[PDB]
Amino acid sequence: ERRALRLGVNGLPNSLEPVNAISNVGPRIVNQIFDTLIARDFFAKGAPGNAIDLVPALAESWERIDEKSVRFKLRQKVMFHDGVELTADDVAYTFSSERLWGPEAIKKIPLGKSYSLDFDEPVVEDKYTVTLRTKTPSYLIETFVASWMSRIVPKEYYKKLGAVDFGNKPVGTGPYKFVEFVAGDRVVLEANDAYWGPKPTASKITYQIVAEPATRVAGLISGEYDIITTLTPDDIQLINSYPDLETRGTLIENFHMFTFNMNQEVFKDKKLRRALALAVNRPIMVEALWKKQASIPAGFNFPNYGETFDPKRKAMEYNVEEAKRLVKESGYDGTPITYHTMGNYYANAMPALMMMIEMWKQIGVNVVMKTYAPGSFPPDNQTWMRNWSNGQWMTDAYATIVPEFGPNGQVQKRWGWKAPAEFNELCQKVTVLPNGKERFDAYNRMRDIFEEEAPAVILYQPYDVYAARKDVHWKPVSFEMMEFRNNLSFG
Ligand SMILES: *O[C@@H]1[C@@H](CO)O[C@@](CO)(O[C@H]2O[C@H](CO)[C@@H](O)[C@H](O)[C@H]2O)[C@H]1O
Ligand SMILES: *OP(=O)(O)O[C@@H]1[C@@H](O)[C@@H](O)CO[C@@H]1O
C-alpha cells in the first residue's frame, strides 16, 4: 500500500468547516478535503511555489461577464466523498446569503459576511452552470473564488448537519477524505481514490498536534514524523546536520502582528498604541530570531497586492524618543499590561514577545506575558495586548485591511477600534473602484491612517520553516497551507 504521511503540527483548527477553519493551521487540512472553482497554481511555469496563476479546478472554465459577474462551467461527474454529484446547487449554496454572507449566516460562519464581497445571490443556469455576482462592481471575484473563502461544500449534507456538526464530519470533493478528529489532538484523513484530479499519493494523512517546537523537532529526529511545521530559522542548522533530514522554507503571504483590545480603557485612544508601535525595533528581531529571513513590509502593503502594492513606500516608523513622549502624554501610570499568546502557535511568538517586553521597559511600559492553551482563547475582557497574524489572501490590497480592519470587520466591531470616518469611507471606495490612480492613492491614505492609529502593529512576514525527511518529496508554497496535488511522493 502507499505510505501514510505523519505530520507534526503546531496546532489544529477548532472546526473543519472550511471558512471557520481559516487560520494558520486549518488550510493545510481543509485544502485536502475540499476543492475550489479556480485554483491558484503556485508552481506554474516552474515557479518555486510562489506563482499567482489561476487555473481551472471544479470549474472547467469561466468567463467574466461584466464588472460584477463571472459565469462558471462546472466539471461534470465530480463526486463529494459521500457519493453526491457536485452541481451548481452546491456552488450556489456555498456562496449564498443563507450560508455565507447574509445576516442569517452569522450563526453558521461568524466572519462570513465581514470576509465576503458584496455578493448578490448566485444565478444557477443549469446543473453545471452558475454565475457568481456582486450587487456593486467588483473586480475581485476571481481572486476571491480561488481563496480560502471559497472551498465548495455539499448543500444537502451541510444543511442536514448544520455548520457546527459539518465541521466535525466534513464532506468535500478533495483528494483526501475525513476519517477522525480528536479535538486538540489529531485529524486523520484517507486517500479519496475517486478524486477527479491528480490521484492521492499517500494512503492516509495524520495531523498530530505537538505544541512545543522542541518536542516536534525531537519527533522528526526520532522518526515519528515525516514533516513538521512552524519552526524558526534558529532550528535550521541542527536539522540540516542530519543527512536524512532537511528544512524547506519560504516567505509566505502573511504577516505576524500584535494588536489590542480597544474596549479596554488604556487602549481606547491611539497614544499608548502608537507608543508601543514606535518602540518596536523590527530589524533587530529579524536578525536575532529569524536569521535575516523574515521580511519587514513598508506598512500594510505586500507584493502580492500586485497593482496595489506600493514599492516606493517608506518604512514603518521607529522612534524611541517619540515613543517615550507618547507614554508620558497618555497618562500611563506604570501598571502592568498583559500580552496573551498561545505558546508558540506563531513561530517565534514568545521569543519576539520577550524582546519586545525589553524594548517597552526602555520606554517606561511594563508588559507581561500571559499564556493560554491550544483552543482556550481567553474572554475578550481579560485581554489587553495579544498576538495575531493575517494571511494576505487576495492578489489585491483589499485583503486584509478591509475585511479585518474595515467598518464591517472584527477589529472595529468586536475589538473596539474607533476608526476615523475617513478610513471607513476609503474602505468603501476601494471595494468598488477598478485599479487606477484613485484606488492606488486611497490604499496609501488607508495605510497612513493605519500607522497613525495603530489598531495593530505589523511585525513582519514570517519565513515559514518546515522540516522533512529527505525521502518525503514535497515543496512549500508561499501561503499558510500545504499543497500535495502533484507535490507529494515518497522514496
Ligand atoms: O489567527 C487565529 C484566529 C482564527 O480565528 O483565532 C486564533 C486565536 O487564538 O486561534 C483560534 O482558532 C484557530 C482556528 O480554529 C485554532 O486553531 C486555535 O487553536 C484557536 O485558538 C488565532 O491564532
Ligand atoms: O491563525 P491565525 O493568525 O489567527 O489566522 C488568521 C485569521 O484569523 C485571519 O486573520 C486570516 O489570516 C489568518 O489565517
Side-chain angles (χ1 to χ4, degrees):
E1 297 170 347
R2 285 159 289 192
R3 231 171 108 186
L5 187 67
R6 310 154 301 158
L7 308 177
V9 302
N10 57 318
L12 290 169
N14 290 329
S15 172
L16 302 170
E17 194 292 343
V19 178
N20 294 329
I22 285 169
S23 61
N24 287 182
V25 298
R28 62 177 75 117
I29 308 175
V30 301
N31 187 47
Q32 317 312 328
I33 304 172
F34 301 96
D35 295 291
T36 51
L37 297 171
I38 297 170
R40 179 170 169 187
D41 182 5
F42 289 88
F43 300 103
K45 294 141 177 168
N50 61 1
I52 63 162
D53 294 56
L54 295 187
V55 300
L58 291 174
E60 63 185 5
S61 64
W62 72 90
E63 63 193 357
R64 178 169 276 263
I65 299 161
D66 65 11
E67 74 283 355
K68 59 199 181 301
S69 63
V70 181
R71 182 182 288 111
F72 296 86
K73 294 285 175 184
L74 307 177
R75 196 176 298 280
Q76 308 189 10
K77 305 287 142 199
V78 168
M79 284 198 284
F80 282 102
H81 302 139
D82 68 354
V84 171
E85 184 185 5
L86 168 76
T87 80
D89 194 21
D90 301 297
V91 177
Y93 183 74
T94 293
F95 296 94
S96 68
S97 175
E98 183 183 348
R99 178 265 175 172
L100 183 59
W101 53 263
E104 59 276 40
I106 202 187
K107 222 218 84 168
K108 296 159 193 178
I109 303 176
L111 297 166
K113 175 178 159 62
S114 69
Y115 287 5
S116 286
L117 303 180
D118 185 29
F119 290 123
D120 206 347
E121 298 278 18
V123 180
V124 172
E125 266 169 278
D126 65 74
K127 189 180 176 184
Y128 305 119
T129 310
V130 59
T131 297
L132 304 177
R133 56 178 185 164
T134 49
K135 294 183 179 182
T136 56
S138 182
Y139 303 85
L140 305 181
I141 296 170
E142 297 89 339
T143 185
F144 187 97
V145 163
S147 82
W148 56 10
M149 288 297 291
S150 300
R151 282 166 173 115
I152 306 302
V153 297
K155 179 177 185 182
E156 301 311 336
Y157 179 90
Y158 191 114
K159 285 178 74 180
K160 189 177 73 181
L161 271 68
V164 171
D165 281 359
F166 180 85
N168 295 324
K169 200 168 177 79
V171 164
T173 55
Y176 294 86
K177 64 192 171 181
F178 182 71
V179 173
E180 67 170 356
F181 184 9
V182 182
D185 182 46
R186 70 179 181 278
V187 170
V188 181
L189 311 183
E190 71 180 311
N192 169 21
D193 290 314
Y195 187 55
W196 61 269
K199 295 299 187 178
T201 54
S203 56
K204 173 168 139 181
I205 305 173
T206 299
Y207 302 80
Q208 175 63 59
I209 192 167
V210 186
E212 296 286 333
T215 307
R216 216 180 301 132
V217 171
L220 184 71
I221 294 166
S222 76
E224 283 203 44
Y225 301 113
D226 290 309
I227 306 166
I228 61 175
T229 76
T230 328
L231 304 180
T232 72
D234 290 339
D235 296 317
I236 290 170
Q237 286 166 318
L238 176 69
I239 292 169
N240 288 291
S241 80
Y242 287 88
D244 306 299
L245 305 177
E246 69 187 3
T247 59
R248 305 184 184 147
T250 185
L251 205 66
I252 64 162
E253 296 158 22
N254 175 274
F255 66 94
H256 286 193
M257 73 182 99
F258 64 89
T259 187
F260 307 91
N261 180 355
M262 293 162 276
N263 299 300
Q264 301 289 13
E265 194 71 16
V266 77
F267 293 133
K268 287 187 179 178
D269 178 71
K270 69 181 171 178
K271 285 177 224 77
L272 197 62
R273 299 194 309 241
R274 278 271 293 174
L276 293 158
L278 286 167
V280 180
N281 191 329
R282 300 165 182 91
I284 206 67
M285 298 170 73
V286 167
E287 286 292 339
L289 309 178
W290 296 95
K291 296 275 190 279
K292 312 171 177 80
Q293 302 183 285
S295 191
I296 301 162
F300 208 141
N301 182 39
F302 301 91
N304 67 98
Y305 298 172
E307 292 187 298
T308 49
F309 171 57
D310 188 355
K312 303 190 220 282
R313 194 160 170 92
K314 291 172 78 283
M316 300 181 289
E317 298 161 84
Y318 173 59
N319 193 340
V320 168
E321 297 304 312
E322 186 179 351
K324 287 173 181 172
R325 289 192 222 262
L326 283 164
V327 171
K328 288 182 182 72
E329 205 196 349
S330 76
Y332 173 78
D333 65 11
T335 294
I337 300 170
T338 60
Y339 184 126
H340 275 87
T341 186
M342 198 163 70
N344 291 318
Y345 172 94
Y346 299 120
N348 272 320
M350 300 191 283
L353 180 52
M354 302 296 109
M355 285 185 78
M356 290 186 295
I357 285 170
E358 178 59 38
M359 299 170 184
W360 295 323
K361 179 236 165 186
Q362 297 176 7
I363 68 160
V365 183
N366 182 325
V367 175
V368 300
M369 183 171 74
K370 295 295 199 177
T371 64
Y372 63 96
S376 310
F377 189 82
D380 290 9
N381 78 8
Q382 299 307 110
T383 78
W384 268 263
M385 302 178 75
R386 69 188 188 285
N387 56 17
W388 190 32
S389 88
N390 280 180
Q392 303 308 291
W393 58 265
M394 296 183 168
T395 56
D396 191 81
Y398 178 88
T400 50
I401 201 168
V402 181
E404 298 293 4
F405 295 83
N408 301 310
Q410 66 180 321
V411 174
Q412 292 188 45
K413 294 186 108 157
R414 173 173 176 185
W415 298 104
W417 183 36
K418 293 277 164 289
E422 182 186 2
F423 185 93
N424 292 335
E425 292 157 16
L426 291 164
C427 286
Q428 295 301 319
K429 293 177 199 297
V430 299
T431 296
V432 301
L433 288 165
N435 278 331
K437 191 185 165 61
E438 186 183 358
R439 195 173 186 255
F440 187 91
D441 292 349
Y443 276 112
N444 274 329
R445 178 59 180 149
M446 289 161 59
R447 292 168 184 130
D448 291 348
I449 293 163
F450 176 93
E451 283 172 47
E452 289 176 22
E453 285 275 321
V457 179
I458 297 170
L459 290 174
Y460 37 66
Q461 290 182 252
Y463 185 74
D464 202 3
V465 180
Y466 296 87
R469 295 181 58 72
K470 285 188 184 180
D471 68 4
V472 173
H473 311 293
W474 165 72
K475 298 181 187 193
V477 299
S478 61
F479 199 79
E480 66 203 78
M481 62 193 278
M482 299 175 82
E483 181 59 60
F484 305 134
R485 296 168 182 83
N486 292 137
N487 188 36
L488 181 65
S489 63
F490 300 103

